[PDB]
PDB file of all heavy atoms in Angstrom:
ATOM      1  N   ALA Y   1      19.933   6.992  17.381  1.00 19.13           N
ATOM      2  CA  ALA Y   1      18.957   6.976  16.230  1.00 19.13           C
ATOM      3  C   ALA Y   1      18.246   8.480  16.378  1.00 19.13           C
ATOM      4  O   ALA Y   1      18.474   9.233  17.339  1.00 19.13           O
ATOM      5  CB  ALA Y   1      17.786   5.981  16.410  1.00 19.13           C
ATOM      6  N   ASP Y   2      17.397   8.733  15.348  1.00 18.21           N
ATOM      7  CA  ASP Y   2      16.482   9.880  15.311  1.00 18.21           C
ATOM      8  C   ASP Y   2      15.150   9.350  15.811  1.00 18.21           C
ATOM      9  O   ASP Y   2      14.620   8.386  15.249  1.00 18.21           O
ATOM     10  CB  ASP Y   2      16.503  10.528  14.014  1.00 18.21           C
ATOM     11  CG  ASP Y   2      16.141  12.041  13.953  1.00 18.21           C
ATOM     12  OD1 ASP Y   2      15.567  12.454  14.957  1.00 18.21           O
ATOM     13  OD2 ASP Y   2      16.454  12.681  13.021  1.00 18.21           O
ATOM     14  N   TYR Y   3      14.622   9.945  16.974  1.00 19.92           N
ATOM     15  CA  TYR Y   3      13.382   9.444  17.374  1.00 19.92           C
ATOM     16  C   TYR Y   3      12.284  10.509  17.284  1.00 19.92           C
ATOM     17  O   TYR Y   3      12.506  11.694  17.655  1.00 19.92           O
ATOM     18  CB  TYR Y   3      13.532   9.148  18.985  1.00 19.92           C
ATOM     19  CG  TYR Y   3      14.227   7.952  19.262  1.00 19.92           C
ATOM     20  CD1 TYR Y   3      15.665   8.038  19.473  1.00 19.92           C
ATOM     21  CD2 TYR Y   3      13.708   6.734  19.465  1.00 19.92           C
ATOM     22  CE1 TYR Y   3      16.380   6.942  19.749  1.00 19.92           C
ATOM     23  CE2 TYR Y   3      14.411   5.531  19.738  1.00 19.92           C
ATOM     24  CZ  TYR Y   3      15.771   5.717  19.870  1.00 19.92           C
ATOM     25  OH  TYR Y   3      16.482   4.628  20.121  1.00 19.92           O
ATOM     26  N   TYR Y   4      11.077  10.109  16.683  1.00 19.03           N
ATOM     27  CA  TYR Y   4      10.027  10.968  16.452  1.00 19.03           C
ATOM     28  C   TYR Y   4       8.832  10.596  17.187  1.00 19.03           C
ATOM     29  O   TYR Y   4       8.331   9.400  17.199  1.00 19.03           O
ATOM     30  CB  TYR Y   4       9.717  10.970  14.850  1.00 19.03           C
ATOM     31  CG  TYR Y   4      10.839  11.463  13.997  1.00 19.03           C
ATOM     32  CD1 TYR Y   4      11.887  10.558  13.633  1.00 19.03           C
ATOM     33  CD2 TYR Y   4      10.918  12.717  13.550  1.00 19.03           C
ATOM     34  CE1 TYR Y   4      12.886  11.020  12.915  1.00 19.03           C
ATOM     35  CE2 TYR Y   4      12.034  13.254  12.800  1.00 19.03           C
ATOM     36  CZ  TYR Y   4      12.977  12.326  12.450  1.00 19.03           C
ATOM     37  OH  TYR Y   4      14.018  12.750  11.660  1.00 19.03           O
ATOM     38  N   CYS Y   5       8.198  11.549  17.879  1.00 19.83           N
ATOM     39  CA  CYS Y   5       6.892  11.285  18.452  1.00 19.83           C
ATOM     40  C   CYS Y   5       5.907  11.641  17.391  1.00 19.83           C
ATOM     41  O   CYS Y   5       6.126  12.473  16.498  1.00 19.83           O
ATOM     42  CB  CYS Y   5       6.673  12.146  19.675  1.00 19.83           C
ATOM     43  SG  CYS Y   5       6.837  13.899  19.515  1.00 19.83           S
ATOM     44  N   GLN Y   6       4.690  11.160  17.468  1.00 20.53           N
ATOM     45  CA  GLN Y   6       3.620  11.281  16.528  1.00 20.53           C
ATOM     46  C   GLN Y   6       2.324  11.154  17.094  1.00 20.53           C
ATOM     47  O   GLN Y   6       2.096  10.203  17.933  1.00 20.53           O
ATOM     48  CB  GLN Y   6       3.841  10.190  15.479  1.00 20.53           C
ATOM     49  CG  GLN Y   6       2.925  10.304  14.265  1.00 20.53           C
ATOM     50  CD  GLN Y   6       1.881   9.275  14.332  1.00 20.53           C
ATOM     51  OE1 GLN Y   6       2.270   8.067  14.499  1.00 20.53           O
ATOM     52  NE2 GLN Y   6       0.643   9.631  14.237  1.00 20.53           N
ATOM     53  N   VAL Y   7       1.273  11.926  16.640  1.00 21.19           N
ATOM     54  CA  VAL Y   7      -0.043  11.746  17.116  1.00 21.19           C
ATOM     55  C   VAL Y   7      -0.999  12.019  15.858  1.00 21.19           C
ATOM     56  O   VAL Y   7      -0.596  12.454  14.903  1.00 21.19           O
ATOM     57  CB  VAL Y   7      -0.395  12.762  18.210  1.00 21.19           C
ATOM     58  CG1 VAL Y   7       0.579  12.641  19.307  1.00 21.19           C
ATOM     59  CG2 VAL Y   7      -0.477  14.229  17.634  1.00 21.19           C
ATOM     60  N   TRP Y   8      -2.277  11.744  16.199  1.00 17.81           N
ATOM     61  CA  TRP Y   8      -3.441  12.103  15.360  1.00 17.81           C
ATOM     62  C   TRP Y   8      -4.040  13.353  15.959  1.00 17.81           C
ATOM     63  O   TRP Y   8      -4.341  13.465  17.185  1.00 17.81           O
ATOM     64  CB  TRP Y   8      -4.425  10.896  15.311  1.00 17.81           C
ATOM     65  CG  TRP Y   8      -5.564  10.933  14.337  1.00 17.81           C
ATOM     66  CD1 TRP Y   8      -5.643  10.354  13.251  1.00 17.81           C
ATOM     67  CD2 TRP Y   8      -6.893  11.622  14.639  1.00 17.81           C
ATOM     68  NE1 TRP Y   8      -6.936  10.493  12.752  1.00 17.81           N
ATOM     69  CE2 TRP Y   8      -7.618  11.259  13.546  1.00 17.81           C
ATOM     70  CE3 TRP Y   8      -7.275  12.297  15.652  1.00 17.81           C
ATOM     71  CZ2 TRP Y   8      -8.932  11.754  13.461  1.00 17.81           C
ATOM     72  CZ3 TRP Y   8      -8.633  12.803  15.546  1.00 17.81           C
ATOM     73  CH2 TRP Y   8      -9.401  12.513  14.511  1.00 17.81           C
ATOM     74  N   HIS Y   9      -4.142  14.356  15.159  1.00 19.22           N
ATOM     75  CA  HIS Y   9      -4.712  15.683  15.650  1.00 19.22           C
ATOM     76  C   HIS Y   9      -6.191  15.695  15.333  1.00 19.22           C
ATOM     77  O   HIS Y   9      -7.008  16.019  16.091  1.00 19.22           O
ATOM     78  CB  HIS Y   9      -3.948  16.869  15.020  1.00 19.22           C
ATOM     79  CG  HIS Y   9      -4.611  18.073  15.292  1.00 19.22           C
ATOM     80  ND1 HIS Y   9      -5.245  18.406  16.535  1.00 19.22           N
ATOM     81  CD2 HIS Y   9      -4.667  19.246  14.529  1.00 19.22           C
ATOM     82  CE1 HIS Y   9      -5.698  19.630  16.483  1.00 19.22           C
ATOM     83  NE2 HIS Y   9      -5.416  20.234  15.313  1.00 19.22           N
ATOM     84  N   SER Y  10      -6.529  15.410  14.111  1.00 20.19           N
ATOM     85  CA  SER Y  10      -7.912  15.491  13.560  1.00 20.19           C
ATOM     86  C   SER Y  10      -8.108  14.756  12.296  1.00 20.19           C
ATOM     87  O   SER Y  10      -7.094  14.329  11.724  1.00 20.19           O
ATOM     88  CB  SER Y  10      -8.228  17.049  13.479  1.00 20.19           C
ATOM     89  OG  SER Y  10      -7.755  17.499  12.270  1.00 20.19           O
ATOM     90  N   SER Y  11      -9.311  14.705  11.866  1.00 22.34           N
ATOM     91  CA  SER Y  11      -9.678  14.165  10.543  1.00 22.34           C
ATOM     92  C   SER Y  11      -8.798  14.761   9.496  1.00 22.34           C
ATOM     93  O   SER Y  11      -8.203  14.059   8.588  1.00 22.34           O
ATOM     94  CB  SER Y  11     -11.242  14.423  10.220  1.00 22.34           C
ATOM     95  OG  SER Y  11     -11.494  15.711  10.603  1.00 22.34           O
ATOM     96  N   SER Y  12      -8.696  16.114   9.497  1.00 22.60           N
ATOM     97  CA  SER Y  12      -7.927  16.856   8.452  1.00 22.60           C
ATOM     98  C   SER Y  12      -6.507  17.015   8.724  1.00 22.60           C
ATOM     99  O   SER Y  12      -5.731  17.548   7.905  1.00 22.60           O
ATOM    100  CB  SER Y  12      -8.555  18.241   8.185  1.00 22.60           C
ATOM    101  OG  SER Y  12      -8.868  18.799   9.488  1.00 22.60           O
ATOM    102  N   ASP Y  13      -5.938  16.398   9.895  1.00 21.34           N
ATOM    103  CA  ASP Y  13      -4.637  16.469  10.364  1.00 21.34           C
ATOM    104  C   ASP Y  13      -4.222  15.207  11.001  1.00 21.34           C
ATOM    105  O   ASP Y  13      -4.030  15.062  12.264  1.00 21.34           O
ATOM    106  CB  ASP Y  13      -4.454  17.644  11.262  1.00 21.34           C
ATOM    107  CG  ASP Y  13      -3.047  18.077  11.397  1.00 21.34           C
ATOM    108  OD1 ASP Y  13      -2.159  17.574  10.580  1.00 21.34           O
ATOM    109  OD2 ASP Y  13      -2.733  19.007  12.212  1.00 21.34           O
ATOM    110  N   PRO Y  14      -4.325  14.078  10.280  1.00 22.39           N
ATOM    111  CA  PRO Y  14      -4.290  12.655  10.932  1.00 22.39           C
ATOM    112  C   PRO Y  14      -2.971  12.228  11.352  1.00 22.39           C
ATOM    113  O   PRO Y  14      -2.906  11.264  12.092  1.00 22.39           O
ATOM    114  CB  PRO Y  14      -4.958  11.797   9.871  1.00 22.39           C
ATOM    115  CG  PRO Y  14      -4.597  12.491   8.502  1.00 22.39           C
ATOM    116  CD  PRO Y  14      -4.544  13.980   8.760  1.00 22.39           C
ATOM    117  N   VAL Y  15      -1.956  12.865  10.915  1.00 24.10           N
ATOM    118  CA  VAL Y  15      -0.630  12.312  11.223  1.00 24.10           C
ATOM    119  C   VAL Y  15       0.320  13.492  11.330  1.00 24.10           C
ATOM    120  O   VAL Y  15       0.818  14.121  10.356  1.00 24.10           O
ATOM    121  CB  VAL Y  15      -0.067  11.396  10.164  1.00 24.10           C
ATOM    122  CG1 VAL Y  15       1.433  10.874  10.546  1.00 24.10           C
ATOM    123  CG2 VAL Y  15      -1.007  10.115   9.981  1.00 24.10           C
ATOM    124  N   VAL Y  16       0.669  13.803  12.637  1.00 23.76           N
ATOM    125  CA  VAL Y  16       1.543  14.895  13.002  1.00 23.76           C
ATOM    126  C   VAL Y  16       2.889  14.290  13.642  1.00 23.76           C
ATOM    127  O   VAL Y  16       2.649  13.526  14.459  1.00 23.76           O
ATOM    128  CB  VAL Y  16       0.926  15.938  13.988  1.00 23.76           C
ATOM    129  CG1 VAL Y  16       1.917  17.026  14.278  1.00 23.76           C
ATOM    130  CG2 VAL Y  16      -0.244  16.434  13.256  1.00 23.76           C
ATOM    131  N   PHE Y  17       3.979  14.688  13.104  1.00 26.45           N
ATOM    132  CA  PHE Y  17       5.226  14.271  13.678  1.00 26.45           C
ATOM    133  C   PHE Y  17       5.972  15.409  14.516  1.00 26.45           C
ATOM    134  O   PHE Y  17       5.853  16.572  14.084  1.00 26.45           O
ATOM    135  CB  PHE Y  17       6.240  13.827  12.614  1.00 26.45           C
ATOM    136  CG  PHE Y  17       6.043  12.415  11.987  1.00 26.45           C
ATOM    137  CD1 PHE Y  17       5.361  12.271  10.771  1.00 26.45           C
ATOM    138  CD2 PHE Y  17       6.360  11.300  12.710  1.00 26.45           C
ATOM    139  CE1 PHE Y  17       5.116  11.134  10.207  1.00 26.45           C
ATOM    140  CE2 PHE Y  17       6.039  10.040  12.197  1.00 26.45           C
ATOM    141  CZ  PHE Y  17       5.433   9.987  10.930  1.00 26.45           C
ATOM    142  N   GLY Y  18       6.628  15.109  15.531  1.00 26.93           N
ATOM    143  CA  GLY Y  18       7.546  15.985  16.132  1.00 26.93           C
ATOM    144  C   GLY Y  18       8.750  16.227  15.179  1.00 26.93           C
ATOM    145  O   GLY Y  18       8.949  15.507  14.168  1.00 26.93           O
ATOM    146  N   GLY Y  19       9.555  17.224  15.441  1.00 26.83           N
ATOM    147  CA  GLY Y  19      10.768  17.492  14.691  1.00 26.83           C
ATOM    148  C   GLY Y  19      11.841  16.378  14.761  1.00 26.83           C
ATOM    149  O   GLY Y  19      12.729  16.357  14.002  1.00 26.83           O
ATOM    150  N   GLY Y  20      11.777  15.465  15.749  1.00 28.78           N
ATOM    151  CA  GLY Y  20      12.815  14.482  15.872  1.00 28.78           C
ATOM    152  C   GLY Y  20      13.836  14.888  16.835  1.00 28.78           C
ATOM    153  O   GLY Y  20      14.210  16.034  16.865  1.00 28.78           O
ATOM    154  N   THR Y  21      14.257  13.922  17.598  1.00 29.90           N
ATOM    155  CA  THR Y  21      15.376  14.099  18.514  1.00 29.90           C
ATOM    156  C   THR Y  21      16.530  13.120  18.056  1.00 29.90           C
ATOM    157  O   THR Y  21      16.222  11.921  17.969  1.00 29.90           O
ATOM    158  CB  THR Y  21      15.017  13.800  19.960  1.00 29.90           C
ATOM    159  OG1 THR Y  21      14.032  14.807  20.445  1.00 29.90           O
ATOM    160  CG2 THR Y  21      16.284  14.007  20.931  1.00 29.90           C
ATOM    161  N   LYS Y  22      17.647  13.616  17.817  1.00 31.19           N
ATOM    162  CA  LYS Y  22      18.822  12.744  17.452  1.00 31.19           C
ATOM    163  C   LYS Y  22      19.363  12.372  18.759  1.00 31.19           C
ATOM    164  O   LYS Y  22      19.944  13.208  19.489  1.00 31.19           O
ATOM    165  CB  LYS Y  22      19.761  13.458  16.543  1.00 31.19           C
ATOM    166  N   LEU Y  23      19.357  11.005  19.161  1.00 31.59           N
ATOM    167  CA  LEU Y  23      19.999  10.556  20.294  1.00 31.59           C
ATOM    168  C   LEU Y  23      21.400  10.131  19.976  1.00 31.59           C
ATOM    169  O   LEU Y  23      21.423   9.096  19.185  1.00 31.59           O
ATOM    170  CB  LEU Y  23      19.191   9.485  20.951  1.00 31.59           C
ATOM    171  CG  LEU Y  23      19.752   8.890  22.268  1.00 31.59           C
ATOM    172  CD1 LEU Y  23      19.638   9.845  23.437  1.00 31.59           C
ATOM    173  CD2 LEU Y  23      19.042   7.545  22.583  1.00 31.59           C
ATOM    174  N   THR Y  24      22.432  10.712  20.504  1.00 30.92           N
ATOM    175  CA  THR Y  24      23.746  10.250  20.444  1.00 30.92           C
ATOM    176  C   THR Y  24      24.111   9.419  21.732  1.00 30.92           C
ATOM    177  O   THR Y  24      23.971   9.928  22.811  1.00 30.92           O
ATOM    178  CB  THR Y  24      24.729  11.293  20.266  1.00 30.92           C
ATOM    179  OG1 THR Y  24      24.461  12.122  19.124  1.00 30.92           O
ATOM    180  CG2 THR Y  24      26.084  10.827  20.252  1.00 30.92           C
ATOM    181  N   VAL Y  25      24.498   8.150  21.539  1.00 32.52           N
ATOM    182  CA  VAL Y  25      25.110   7.343  22.636  1.00 32.52           C
ATOM    183  C   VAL Y  25      26.595   7.561  22.590  1.00 32.52           C
ATOM    184  O   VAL Y  25      27.140   7.199  21.563  1.00 32.52           O
ATOM    185  CB  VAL Y  25      24.602   5.888  22.574  1.00 32.52           C
ATOM    186  CG1 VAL Y  25      25.122   5.101  23.771  1.00 32.52           C
ATOM    187  CG2 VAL Y  25      23.075   5.856  22.586  1.00 32.52           C
ATOM    188  N   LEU Y  26      27.201   8.038  23.602  1.00 32.04           N
ATOM    189  CA  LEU Y  26      28.603   8.496  23.613  1.00 32.04           C
ATOM    190  C   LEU Y  26      29.523   7.139  23.960  1.00 32.04           C
ATOM    191  O   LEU Y  26      29.952   7.062  25.021  1.00 32.04           O
ATOM    192  CB  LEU Y  26      28.886   9.577  24.566  1.00 32.04           C
ATOM    193  CG  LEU Y  26      28.131  10.933  24.225  1.00 32.04           C
ATOM    194  CD1 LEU Y  26      27.813  11.666  25.504  1.00 32.04           C
ATOM    195  CD2 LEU Y  26      28.790  11.689  23.212  1.00 32.04           C
ATOM    196  N   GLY Y  27      29.631   6.331  22.932  1.00 31.78           N
ATOM    197  CA  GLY Y  27      30.246   5.039  23.158  1.00 31.78           C
ATOM    198  C   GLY Y  27      31.690   4.976  22.871  1.00 31.78           C
ATOM    199  O   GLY Y  27      32.222   3.833  22.834  1.00 31.78           O
ATOM    200  N   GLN Y  28      32.353   6.138  22.705  1.00 31.53           N
ATOM    201  CA  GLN Y  28      33.811   6.115  22.504  1.00 31.53           C
ATOM    202  C   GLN Y  28      34.334   7.436  23.064  1.00 31.53           C
ATOM    203  O   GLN Y  28      33.501   8.281  23.268  1.00 31.53           O
ATOM    204  CB  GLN Y  28      34.130   6.050  20.936  1.00 31.53           C
ATOM    205  CG  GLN Y  28      33.633   7.216  20.140  1.00 31.53           C
ATOM    206  CD  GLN Y  28      33.571   6.874  18.629  1.00 31.53           C
ATOM    207  OE1 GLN Y  28      34.415   7.233  17.938  1.00 31.53           O
ATOM    208  NE2 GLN Y  28      32.530   6.408  18.218  1.00 31.53           N
ATOM    209  N   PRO Y  29      35.589   7.532  23.323  1.00 31.71           N
ATOM    210  CA  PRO Y  29      36.202   8.785  23.885  1.00 31.71           C
ATOM    211  C   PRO Y  29      36.219   9.836  22.819  1.00 31.71           C
ATOM    212  O   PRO Y  29      36.112   9.707  21.651  1.00 31.71           O
ATOM    213  CB  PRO Y  29      37.545   8.386  24.349  1.00 31.71           C
ATOM    214  CG  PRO Y  29      38.014   7.190  23.481  1.00 31.71           C
ATOM    215  CD  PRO Y  29      36.645   6.455  23.055  1.00 31.71           C
ATOM    216  N   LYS Y  30      36.587  11.055  23.288  1.00 31.27           N
ATOM    217  CA  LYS Y  30      36.571  12.278  22.436  1.00 31.27           C
ATOM    218  C   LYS Y  30      37.888  12.158  21.651  1.00 31.27           C
ATOM    219  O   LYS Y  30      38.818  11.535  21.922  1.00 31.27           O
ATOM    220  CB  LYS Y  30      36.725  13.530  23.324  1.00 31.27           C
ATOM    221  CG  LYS Y  30      35.345  13.799  24.135  1.00 31.27           C
ATOM    222  CD  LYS Y  30      35.402  15.113  24.851  1.00 31.27           C
ATOM    223  CE  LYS Y  30      34.188  15.524  25.632  1.00 31.27           C
ATOM    224  NZ  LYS Y  30      33.681  14.355  26.387  1.00 31.27           N
ATOM    225  N   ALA Y  31      37.746  12.855  20.434  1.00 28.27           N
ATOM    226  CA  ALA Y  31      38.824  12.903  19.485  1.00 28.27           C
ATOM    227  C   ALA Y  31      38.827  14.249  18.757  1.00 28.27           C
ATOM    228  O   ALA Y  31      37.756  14.633  18.278  1.00 28.27           O
ATOM    229  CB  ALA Y  31      38.638  11.743  18.362  1.00 28.27           C
ATOM    230  N   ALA Y  32      39.926  14.938  18.920  1.00 25.75           N
ATOM    231  CA  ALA Y  32      40.137  16.263  18.493  1.00 25.75           C
ATOM    232  C   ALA Y  32      40.497  16.226  17.079  1.00 25.75           C
ATOM    233  O   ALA Y  32      41.226  15.424  16.614  1.00 25.75           O
ATOM    234  CB  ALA Y  32      41.231  16.984  19.248  1.00 25.75           C
ATOM    235  N   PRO Y  33      40.013  17.272  16.246  1.00 22.64           N
ATOM    236  CA  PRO Y  33      40.186  17.155  14.786  1.00 22.64           C
ATOM    237  C   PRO Y  33      41.532  17.394  14.306  1.00 22.64           C
ATOM    238  O   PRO Y  33      42.198  18.178  14.839  1.00 22.64           O
ATOM    239  CB  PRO Y  33      39.109  18.253  14.197  1.00 22.64           C
ATOM    240  CG  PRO Y  33      38.931  19.201  15.423  1.00 22.64           C
ATOM    241  CD  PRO Y  33      39.100  18.326  16.652  1.00 22.64           C
ATOM    242  N   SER Y  34      41.877  16.825  13.023  1.00 21.41           N
ATOM    243  CA  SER Y  34      43.032  17.101  12.372  1.00 21.41           C
ATOM    244  C   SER Y  34      42.490  17.984  11.145  1.00 21.41           C
ATOM    245  O   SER Y  34      41.507  17.701  10.526  1.00 21.41           O
ATOM    246  CB  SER Y  34      43.712  15.853  11.772  1.00 21.41           C
ATOM    247  OG  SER Y  34      43.930  14.969  12.841  1.00 21.41           O
TER     248      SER Y  34
END
């Protein structure tokens, strides 16, 4: 998934998100492109 941290900074900045981390779970072997 894409995971976002988030906080309240101030009255005028009440919802701040991080840029997001894309977590890849490597649940299959590698595959080289055609």
Side-chain angles (χ1 to χ4, degrees), residues 1-21 23-34:
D2 207 340
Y3 290 88
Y4 297 84
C5 57
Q6 184 255 311
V7 307
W8 189 99
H9 171 36
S10 80
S11 43
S12 43
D13 201 6
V15 180
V16 175
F17 285 100
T21 298
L23 182 70
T24 299
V25 183
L26 296 154
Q28 66 198 262
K30 293 187 181 42
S34 310

